[PDB]
Scaffold this active site. Structure first.
Site, PDB file in Angstrom:
ATOM      1  N   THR A 143     -24.133  -9.857  81.446  1.00  0.00           N
ATOM      2  CA  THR A 143     -25.183 -10.477  82.245  1.00  0.00           C
ATOM      3  C   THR A 143     -25.041 -11.994  82.262  1.00  0.00           C
ATOM      4  OG1 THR A 143     -27.572 -10.875  82.329  1.00  0.00           O
ATOM      5  CG2 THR A 143     -26.633 -10.217  80.203  1.00  0.00           C
ATOM      6  N   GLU A 200     -10.761  -2.543  41.003  1.00  0.00           N
ATOM      7  CA  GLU A 200     -10.295  -3.528  41.976  1.00  0.00           C
ATOM      8  C   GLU A 200      -8.884  -4.002  41.650  1.00  0.00           C
ATOM      9  OE1 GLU A 200     -12.123  -3.617  44.658  1.00  0.00           O
ATOM     10  OE2 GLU A 200     -13.315  -2.256  43.417  1.00  0.00           O
ATOM     11  N   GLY A 242     -21.716 -10.383  76.682  1.00  0.00           N
ATOM     12  CA  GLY A 242     -22.491 -11.178  77.612  1.00  0.00           C
ATOM     13  C   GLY A 242     -22.116 -10.950  79.060  1.00  0.00           C
TER      14      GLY A 242
END
Lengths: 50, 478
Positions: B59, B274, B57
């Protein structure tokens, strides 16, 4: 003047909030590296860069 | 034309500021206390440049500093300057700076200077000449001739290396401020300010949400706020809790969770994969803190995954040990270890082909990254024999990690079967139950000493040896 020179040669590049808990394993490594450099520089004297 | 109305954004509207905010109010000081600045003899620095990742952000910071300064705000896209016609862009910059000087005091904002601030001589075309003309015009209107002491330019770029060093010359762009990615507190406050407009609860802890979504920009935090509105009407609860935020972060970082038809042996294969990853990871220091363990397929990954959050300071700076990579290669090879130890050598599958190449790439990067001990690092040679021997050490390193993975997974068969059964029955596992199973059926894991214990034993050995030398000098001399 010292801070103006420090800014003007661009020593800092991260540009973040400098608040980081450095581990002992890192302070130790940096201290050992710097001490080794000091020992080698004192034992092998450079006639122009003390 | 380039003047905007209704600039009410202040520093309170923007979070994750830090010490940069101080520089921001310094800019406000430059717009308010400049009388004593020029009384002491200080020329006001016109060029301030914000550099950082997109979506933070910049701007928004421009609107904040313009609102706090209380001056006219100009916000001009740099993409309008480049055009197929020449001369019109220079006139656009001339009109921009003329109306900025007429509207003094004011601040002007131009975003993404990489489009027009490219170094001259990189592209051969009429667009390059037009870009050069516009860059020259903005350079002259910035510093060329006298006439500006009140108009201050603020800019927002992403890549600072592309910019022309002529622009980086002091007096044109001398203040360079980096906007880093938000840390832990920054993500907290950005989530708070982006969530102030919606009704929240008092038992809502942002600490877990911030620690869950690590290493993300403020736009991603605004997105997390945006996925805190759409998904609770499926069940229809009363008030927003932290569970919805955790699930929204889990959805965002990986993808939406979709369920498809699946057999039992496929679930068993994903479960043992896994299990191999998590079980080989928990015995290693850098990958010890496994927090999540699921085999549910996600968007782009039909496999499961193991979630770990190691220390993110040594990784960025480069202070990872040699053993820290020999452990990770073993971790990547351990799926193939479980496959070989369970289905036999003749029935190797192709599900671990994504980790088995990461292991060999990591070994290759290690052997020519100077981390080896063949002569001493020495990742480059001249004769062909040593160049051929360079790639031998990587394959022997893979082999020794490979046998280490076999030994590690063979030590842990009972906990292996237990965690595979739990993964098949529940399709998911958190840290507590997985670690409970590990403590119930784990083997011995003697931890190698850290650097502190090695330094202490070396120091005491050195002291005892030097005092031995002292006595062998003294009592032989006295």
């Amino acid at each position: 003047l010292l801070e103006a020179l420090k800014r003007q040669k661009g020593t800092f590049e991260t540009g973040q909030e400098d608040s980081t808990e450095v581990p002992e394993e890192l302070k130790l490594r940096l201290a050992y590296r710097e001490a080794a450099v000091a020992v080698l520089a004192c034992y092998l004297p450079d006639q122009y860069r003390p | 034309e380039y003047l905007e109305r209704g600039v009410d954004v202040k520093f309170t509207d923007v979070a994750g500021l830090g010490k940069i905010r101080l520089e921001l109010e310094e800019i406000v000081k430059f717009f308010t206390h400049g009388e004593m600045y020029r009384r002491r003899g200080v020329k006001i620095p016109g060029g301030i440049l914000l550099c950082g990742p997109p979506g933070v952000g910049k701007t928004l910071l421009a609107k904040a500093v313009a609102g706090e300064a209380g001056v006219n705000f100009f916000s001009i896209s740099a993409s309008q300057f480049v055009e197929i016609y020449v001369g019109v862009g220079a006139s656009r910059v001339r009109a921009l700076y003329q109306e900025a000087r007429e509207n003094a005091p004011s601040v002007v904002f131009i975003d993404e200077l990489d489009a027009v601030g490219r170094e001259r001589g990189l592209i051969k075309g009429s667009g390059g000449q037009e870009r050069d003309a516009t860059l020259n015009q903005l350079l002259v209107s910035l510093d060329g001739f006298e006439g500006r002491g009140e108009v201050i330019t603020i800019a927002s770029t992403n890549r600072p290396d592309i910019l022309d060093p002529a622009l980086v010359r002091p007096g044109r762009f001398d203040r360079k401020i980096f906007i880093p990615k938000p840390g832990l507190i920054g993500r907290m406050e950005i989530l708070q300010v982006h969530a102030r407009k919606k009704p929240m609860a008092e038992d809502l802890d942002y600490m877990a949400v911030a620690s869950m979504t690590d290493g993300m920009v403020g736009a991603e935090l605004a997105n997390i706020v945006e996925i805190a509105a759409i998904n609770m009407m499926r069940d229809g609860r009363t008030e927003l809790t932290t569970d919805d935020l955790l699930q929204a972060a889990q959805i965002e970082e990986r993808g939406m969770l979709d369920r498809k038809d699946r057999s039992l042996e496929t679930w068993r294969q994903v479960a043992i994969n896994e299990a191999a990853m998590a079980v080989v990871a928990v015995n290693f220091p850098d990958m010890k803190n496994i927090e999540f363990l699921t085999i549910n397929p996600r968007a782009g990954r039909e496999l499961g995954y193991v979630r770990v959050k190691m220390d993110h300071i040594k990784f960025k700076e480069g202070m990872l040990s040699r053993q820290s990579i020999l452990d990770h290669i073993t971790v990547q090879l351990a799926p193939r270890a479980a496959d070989e130890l369970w289905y036999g050598e003749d029935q190797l599958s192709t599900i671990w082909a994504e980790t088995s190449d990461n292991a060999r790439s990591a070994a290759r990067s290690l052997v020519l990254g100077g981390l080896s001990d063949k002569h001493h690092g020495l990742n480059n040679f001249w004769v062909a024999d040593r160049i051929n021997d360079i790639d031998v050490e990587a394959l022997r390193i893979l082999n020794m990690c490979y046998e280490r993975a076999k030994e590690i997974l063979g030590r842990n068969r009972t906990l292996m079967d237990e965690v595979v059964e739990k993964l098949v029955q529940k399709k998911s596992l958190t840290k507590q139950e997985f670690f409970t199973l590990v403590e119930l059926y784990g083997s011995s894991k003697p931890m190698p000493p850290s650097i502190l214990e090695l330094r202490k034993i070396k120091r005491l050995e050195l002291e005892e040896m030097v005092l031995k030398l002292d006595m062998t000098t003294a009592r032989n001399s006295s």
